[PDB]
Amino acid sequence: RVIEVLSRRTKNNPVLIGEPGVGKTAIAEGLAQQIINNEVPEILRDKRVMTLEDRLKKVMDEIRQAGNIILFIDAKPSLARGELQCIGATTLDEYRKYIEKDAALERRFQPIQVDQPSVDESIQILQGLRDRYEAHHRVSITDDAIEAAVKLSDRYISDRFLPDKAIDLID
Amino acid sequence: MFGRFTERAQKVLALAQEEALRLGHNNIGTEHILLGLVREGEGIAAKALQALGLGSEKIQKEVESLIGRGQEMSQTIHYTPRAKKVIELSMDEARKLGHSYVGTEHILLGLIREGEGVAARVLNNLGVSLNKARQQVLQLLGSNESNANTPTLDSLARDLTAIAKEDSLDPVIGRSKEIQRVIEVLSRRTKNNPVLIGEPGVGKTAIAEGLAQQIINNEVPEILRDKRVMTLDMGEDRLKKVMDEIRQAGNIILFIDAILKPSLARGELQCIGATTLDEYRKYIEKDAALERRFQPIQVDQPSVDESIQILQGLRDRYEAHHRVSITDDAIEAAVKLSDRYISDRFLPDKAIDLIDEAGSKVRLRSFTPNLKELEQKLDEVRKEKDAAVQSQEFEKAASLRDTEQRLREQVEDTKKSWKEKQGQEEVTVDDIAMVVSSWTAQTETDKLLNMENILHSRVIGQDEAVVAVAKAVRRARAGLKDPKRPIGSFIFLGPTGVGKTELARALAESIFGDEESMIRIDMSEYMEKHSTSLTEKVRRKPYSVVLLDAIEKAHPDVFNILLQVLEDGRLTTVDFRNTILIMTSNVGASEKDKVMGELKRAFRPEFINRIDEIIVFHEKKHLTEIVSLMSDQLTKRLKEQDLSIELTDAAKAKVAEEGVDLEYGARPLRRAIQKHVEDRLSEELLRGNIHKGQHIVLDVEDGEFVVKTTA
Numbered sequence: 001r002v003i004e005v006l007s008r009r010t011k012n013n014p015v016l017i018g019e020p021g022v023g024k025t026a027i028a029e030g031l032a033q034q035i036i037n038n039e040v041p042e043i044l045r046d047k048r049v050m051t052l053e054d055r056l057k058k059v060m061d062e063i064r065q066a067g068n069i070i071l072f073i074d075a076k077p078s079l080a081r082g083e084l085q086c087i088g089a090t091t092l093d094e095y096r097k098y099i100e101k102d103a104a105l106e107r108r109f110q111p112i113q114v115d116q117p118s119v120d121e122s123i124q125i126l127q128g129l130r131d132r133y134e135a136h137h138r139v140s141i142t143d144d145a146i147e148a149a150v151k152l153s154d155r156y157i158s159d160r161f162l163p164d165k166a167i168d169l170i171d
Numbered sequence: 172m173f174g175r176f177t178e179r180a181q182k183v184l185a186l187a188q189e190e191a192l193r194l195g196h197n198n199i200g201t202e203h204i205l206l207g208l209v210r211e212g213e214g215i216a217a218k219a220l221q222a223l224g225l226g227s228e229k230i231q232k233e234v235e236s237l238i239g240r241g242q243e244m245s246q247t248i249h250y251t252p253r254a255k256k257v258i259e260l261s262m263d264e265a266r267k268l269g270h271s272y273v274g275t276e277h278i279l280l281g282l283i284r285e286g287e288g289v290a291a292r293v294l295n296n297l298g299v300s301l302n303k304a305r306q307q308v309l310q311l312l313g314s315n316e317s318n319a320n321t322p323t324l325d326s327l328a329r330d331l332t333a334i335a336k337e338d339s340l341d342p343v344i345g346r347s348k349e350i351q352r353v354i355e356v357l358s359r360r361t362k363n364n365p366v367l368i369g370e371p372g373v374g375k376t377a378i379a380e381g382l383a384q385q386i387i388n389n390e391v392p393e394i395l396r397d398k399r400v401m402t403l404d405m406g407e408d409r410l411k412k413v414m415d416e417i418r419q420a421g422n423i424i425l426f427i428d429a430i431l432k433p434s435l436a437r438g439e440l441q442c443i444g445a446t447t448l449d450e451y452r453k454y455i456e457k458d459a460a461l462e463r464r465f466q467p468i469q470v471d472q473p474s475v476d477e478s479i480q481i482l483q484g485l486r487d488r489y490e491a492h493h494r495v496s497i498t499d500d501a502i503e504a505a506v507k508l509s510d511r512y513i514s515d516r517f518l519p520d521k522a523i524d525l526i527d528e529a530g531s532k533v534r535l536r537s538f539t540p541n542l543k544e545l546e547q548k549l550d551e552v553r554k555e556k557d558a559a560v561q562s563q564e565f566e567k568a569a570s571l572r573d574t575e576q577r578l579r580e581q582v583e584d585t586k587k588s589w590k591e592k593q594g595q596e597e598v599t600v601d602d603i604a605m606v607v608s609s610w611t612a613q614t615e616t617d618k619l620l621n622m623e624n625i626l627h628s629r630v631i632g633q634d635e636a637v638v639a640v641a642k643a644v645r646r647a648r649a650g651l652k653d654p655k656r657p658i659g660s661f662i663f664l665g666p667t668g669v670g671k672t673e674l675a676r677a678l679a680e681s682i683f684g685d686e687e688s689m690i691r692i693d694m695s696e697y698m699e700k701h702s703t704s705l706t707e708k709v710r711r712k713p714y715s716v717v718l719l720d721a722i723e724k725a726h727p728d729v730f731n732i733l734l735q736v737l738e739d740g741r742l743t744t745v746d747f748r749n750t751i752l753i754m755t756s757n758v759g760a761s762e763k764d765k766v767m768g769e770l771k772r773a774f775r776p777e778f779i780n781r782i783d784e785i786i787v788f789h790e791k792k793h794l795t796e797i798v799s800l801m802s803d804q805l806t807k808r809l810k811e812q813d814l815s816i817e818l819t820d821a822a823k824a825k826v827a828e829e830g831v832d833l834e835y836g837a838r839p840l841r842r843a844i845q846k847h848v849e850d851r852l853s854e855e856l857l858r859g860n861i862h863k864g865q866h867i868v869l870d871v872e873d874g875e876f877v878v879k880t881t882a
Contacts, residue, residue, distance in 0.1 A: 003531060003535065004527070004528065004530075004531035004532050004535065005531070007491075007492045007530070007531040007534070008492070008527040008530060008531065009488075009489060009491060009492070009527065009530075010523050010524055010526075010527040010530075011524060011527065039538045040538065041492075041493060041531070041534045041535070041537070041538060042491060042492040042493050042531060042534055043491070046259075046262070046263070066266065066267075068266070081327070102371065102447070103371050103428070106371070106520070
């Protein structure tokens with residue numbers, strides 16, 4: 001759904017609204033993965049996705065002069081003075097802190113939500129970073145250990161997002 | 172290839188292959204791409220080489236002097252990884268030239284850039300350094316083509332007169348009599364500067380491009396010829412700087428959609444403003460250089476048909492996302508559904524949004540067989556091959572490699588079998604009506620003809636009432652009643668808990684799609700001269716059963732209001748023409764004739780007479796039929812949690828026993844189901860008697876409940 005929008009000519013630039021995280025940063029690491037290997041469409045090849053004041057609009061001119069580039073944002077608009085393809089980091093409400101003063105929103109920028117990742121998908125998400133937290137001594141393993149983290153959260157408080165919570169618990 | 176280039180390109184590329192084999196080699200490297208270019212002898216690339224002193228003669232001699240024959244293998248060959256880079260590059264050596272499409276030059280450009288390789292050496296061998304070469308190609312391509320415009324045209328900010336000069340500008344429709352009203356407000360001396368207010372929405376910004384075209388050629392006062400339209404706006408260090416570099420140049424008109432930053436009227440600083448219905452309220456409210464200088468005109472939500480035309484004009488331009496032009500029959504839906512069906516924008520933005528929702532979505536259903544599995548397989552291979560190769564295991568790979576490519580070509584052959592998922596993937600309506608329902612004809616009038624069957628399955632008893640409503644809705648819904656008035660105005664008389672509300676739900680569900688699209692006010696709240704409604708909830712969902720309970724309580728004031736609703740289906744300024752108004756009351760209650768009497772005496776007649784219709788609301792085996800309905804809703808929601816349960820008919824009987832007492836009715840059944848079923852199954856699962864995911868039956872034995880297992 002980041003791609004129906006990132007093609008348009010209408011509500012062109014997609015804004016990624018969902019309760020914070022993780023997942024969110026993982027969706028753009030998606031396009032990245034998708035354009036490259038490789039199935040994608042309405043003109044989108046050789047396109048980078050890039051991320052994260054006395055250096056401001058400085059670098060931004062290397063773009064009004066070559067345009068293979070989506071910008072990935074975290075937190076502002078130096079504005080659709082032209083190109084500028086960007087994916088939105090913002091909250092259920094935080095986005096209503098753009099379209100009210102309007103109306104670059106209902107125009108350029110345009111939204112989509114992060115459902116909380118699939119419970120089972122939730123599980124096989126840790127195992128990937130299981131290896132990498134093995135950094136503190138215990139995990140890798142146990143699988144029977146993660147099953148916990150994830151299921152506990154989805155119904156037993158239960159006031160976050162179904163992929164972010166679990167991870168915290170491990171820690 | 173790897174995309175699309177000129178013939179010349181495409182010919183020169185395949186031409187490398189021609190040379191691939193003519194020498195018998197097996198991979199076409201950068202050296203063949205080069206032979207490809209000098210051997211089509213007519214491309215710009217070809218032309219250049221003729222310059223440096225490099226005919227096909229001189230080159231191929233160096234090449235054969237570094238490779239020669241000639242394993243005729245020709246086992247369906249592929250590229251060098253270098254050369255695949257070389258192609259990826261020409262694509263970029265043309266982004267870098269505005270050349271919308273690659274061609275003979277760019278590929279020669281692309282070679283130099285990735286100089287590591289065989290071509291490069293042919294030449295550093297033929298005494299032709301790499302740069303002397305990129306030069307020759309360059310010196311065979313080039314370019315293409317008022318003072319104050321400098322500071323200005325600089326910023327910022329899109330010179331509309333400009334985009335309207337080379338005629339590189341869309342129509343655009345109109346709002347043609349709208350464009351004109353701007354030029355009065357602009358040819359003046361009083362209200363010098365115009366300001367458009369409407370939902371934002373109607374791409375107000377569209378009307379502005381209107382001047383560009385007309386000021387040019389040319390219908391406009393000699394009072395305005397020789398001027399320029401430009402844009403932005405709002406509000407940084409580039410302050411009064413460029414604005415000084417404009418007052419010093421009178422030929423300028425400007426466009427905004429934001430703040431004030433008003434140095435108004437001062438210079439020839441002349442504007443055109445686009446700001447919301449209200450936001451303007453919040454600027455002449457500033458006053459009074461506002462009410463003075465700048466000055467407004469009403470932007471219309473385009474005539475529905477006009478909408479359609481706008482779409483097409485830019486249809487050919489949304490072919491960008493790969494599916495349009497057409498279908499017309501589809502456009503009409505994009506548009507038409509929005510004017511009447513949700514129903515929360517301007518009639519030209521809405522459209523295009525439906526189109527774009529779909530203006531990738533289908534190009535996508537393209538990109539989604541289970542041959543996801545093949546690639547999965549091929550992987551395990553490389554490894555064996557690869558890791559084996561690290562152990563060697565050599566001939567243990569030879570065949571391993573071969574086993575690999577066996578796979579690959581198979582993959583790519585069915586990965587390009589989905590050019591068929593391309594020749595397959597439309598537009599028609601059904602696409603849209605989806606989009607619509609996801610924003611809120613046989614089995615649509617069948618809901619109507621068969622309404623009674625439908626309302627009956629939810630509302631029990633009460634056939635007197637159902638048929639009256641069915642027919643009334645069907646009257647209005649068929650063209651007979653006046654459209655500005657609600658779909659239906661009813662009064663529901665009768666005792667409590669008979670079906671008054673229940674029918675209102677079933678109506679919402681059947682008519683509006685959602686058993687929950689129902690506003691419900693309690694007139695107990697409106698008994699005093701404080702009778703100020705409601706209109707919020709109706710603005711919220713303007714398509715909903717509006718249910719006012721117990722109207723006998725309202726201050727007769729209220730009726731003056733409702734009356735206005737019944738008459739005009741409008742308040743002042745909400746809209747009801749799409750509601751189904753239902754007002755309940757106890758006026759009959761205690762008590763069809765003695766009743767209609769107590770009604771005429773309780774309500775002003777002016778009122779009773781504008782109401783479409785006055786509706787009157789008048790076993791063990793049913794209880795257990797209910798218990799079963801409930802029990803089934805349950806056994807389904809458990810199957811989801813890997814729990815398989817079943818009640819015997821004997822068991823549903825025993826639950827039903829618990830709603831016989833005429834006094835409390837069938838309320839108790841929900842609770843008694845959770846107690847005798849839910850609570851008991853838990854206690855039974857926890858105590859360890861039922862190893863979940865076996866099949867669990869609830870039965871009655873000696874007049875007592877019993878749990879049984881039968882996996």
